[PDB]
């Protein structure tokens, strides 16, 4: 990955102003509803039978926050993301057995949720940088699957 | 396929945001060409392949006109979009992978402009709808 | 959607290669797990997620029995594959993107085994067919 | 991409036995039939609204051989593939306006035509290495798209 200074600036800007406790639960809920097969890993979370149950599930909420804060390390290491995420990649593959395509789906849900929060401020350029960052993180999270 | 729940959801959201179809179109095509610049290949016959340009603005009008068309034809998208399918297939030769890209951008656009209306429930239904539009547009290809 | 032309071509090809379904299934699932190791996430409950293993071999029979059913229900795949959709959606939670992967593997396997029969025309109709299979399995998911 | 010795050997073996004047026309012909939007770039080559008219087309057959031979420089430049294909990527983008997703599609067609020629020798491991190679060359060809 080659980052431009303006991409760095945007990523920094977005995460310094992110309300993780709002965006995280919103993005994971959305993923579970729009892409319900991701529910595969949340069997111990309590009721998920319909959208309102999921939006209302406090456990899905705290996990969305955790997943969102999992991005923090790549922001803080923009040039070494593949290496930084290797242990998380290994975890998701060998212990959690999570299909890495779901990383892309959750990513798009994070983008769509952030877009609703930022509104008009989520410009195409902003989107391009944010997606680029998420794509580089997702690549890394799928890297140790063998 | 779209259930009655799905169709009512798409109908209700489009009832709400349809007034803004033109602006939705410009914003979505603008996002497509900046975030996914490989898509600009289809518009090389235009000098003005840049966000919000006159060809993009006017074009975004036609595209969301096509989505409004699809909403009115939602019980049978294949029949409904057959002429548009023929256009993208033989005149335009647009690889159907690009419909997925534009669909994402429209969702992003509507999330920015109608966050209250674009509930997770609205989203899963409209996503199913747009995947169906994409399938119908591929009808005449091969 | 599949034309009469497509239906005729798939039926004609399955008539020719159907007796080898079991071997094709083994081959196709083996390639899937070797070439696309991420798909192994759905077989974490088997000890032998290796190419040609007892488990992959036996499962390959069942998967192609599934494709056999689809050819027989080609006029209405949504209805024909509903139980398989319910199982992949509600029990297995298989992301439908993986259907595209297995589909490519089936085409590779059939080209290696049946070169004279797998013509470019047989190919386009079978790929159209397998994509319909994937959409039909996707039906009960959301 | 980090290559293993087995991977280099498989690719090496495949290209040294490659009958280009056979595979190239077949792979491009199959691409133009299975994925007929790729006909976007062949207008004056003659009438290809038909599979037999496509398969019988010499302009088409001549371009399939060139394109297949466009892989040779990667075979020789396996640890420098992005750089080696940079000129070609810029050509396909700014000169030819080729949708880069078409590279992936053509790549799958070459895999399938190669699988039919090699038959049982086209094992799971062989297909993995060969698709890996094309994957990297496809990334390279789409890299200078701006
Ligand atoms: C942006 C992509 C993702 C990131 C950055 C991420 C990050 C994380 C982090 C930081 C942890 C906790 C580490 C630990 O406790 O050892 C974790 C665990 C976990 N992740 Fe992910 N995750 C992502 C996507 C997903 C997806 C899409 C799902 C499945 C749909 C998933 C399922 C899980 C599960 C089930 C756990 C175990 C936590 C527990 O046992 O409570 N993650 N992930
Ligand atoms: C939501 C999916 C889409 C819809 C509803 C749609 C609809 C339309 C409409 C209504 C027209 C104009 C019809 C006419 O003037 O006869 C059109 C033309 C066109 N579309 Fe699409 N389209 C979609 C996706 C795409 C995509 C993804 C691309 C390429 C990346 C594309 C490329 C084109 C081009 C190049 C033209 C001609 C524009 C011109 O020459 O000014 N379309 N489409
Ligand atoms: C071409 C599309 C596919 C068809 C027709 C198909 C068919 C089937 C059938 C008929 C069964 C039931 C076997 C039994 O009776 O025990 C099955 C089970 C299963 N399928 Fe699929 N399948 C397809 C794609 C996939 C993909 C792509 C994956 C994962 C990457 C997958 C994962 C599974 C799993 C995990 C099971 C259960 C196996 C077991 O525990 O014995 N399927 N499939
Ligand atoms: C495996 C992927 C491909 C490789 C390695 C490849 C390689 C090449 C090479 C080496 C050239 C010569 C450029 C020159 O004129 O100096 C070329 C030209 C060209 N290729 Fe590609 N190509 C690939 C895919 C494609 C695809 C998918 C298409 C269109 C659908 C395409 C269309 C063309 C065209 C139109 C030209 C120029 C012909 C002319 O000189 O008039 N290529 N390609």
GROMACS .gro file of C-alpha atoms in nm, chain D residues 1-2 4 18 25-26 30 35 54 58-59 66 71 81 98 101 105 124 129:
model
   19
  431UNK     CA    1   0.317  -1.217  -0.332
  432UNK     CA    2   0.586  -1.450  -0.195
  434UNK     CA    3   0.724  -2.105  -0.305
  448UNK     CA    4   0.221  -2.425  -2.352
  455UNK     CA    5  -0.738  -1.835  -2.969
  456UNK     CA    6  -0.944  -2.081  -2.762
  460UNK     CA    7  -1.441  -1.865  -2.503
  465UNK     CA    8  -1.861  -1.300  -2.133
  484UNK     CA    9  -1.629  -1.583  -3.312
  488UNK     CA   10  -0.864  -1.489  -3.734
  489UNK     CA   11  -0.834  -1.141  -3.594
  496UNK     CA   12  -0.063  -1.199  -2.835
  501UNK     CA   13   0.210  -1.347  -1.977
  511UNK     CA   14   0.531  -0.841  -1.184
  528UNK     CA   15  -1.049  -0.185  -2.116
  531UNK     CA   16  -1.260  -0.676  -1.455
  535UNK     CA   17  -1.272  -1.301  -1.676
  554UNK     CA   18  -0.585  -2.893  -0.746
  559UNK     CA   19  -0.043  -2.204  -0.856
   0.00000   0.00000   0.00000
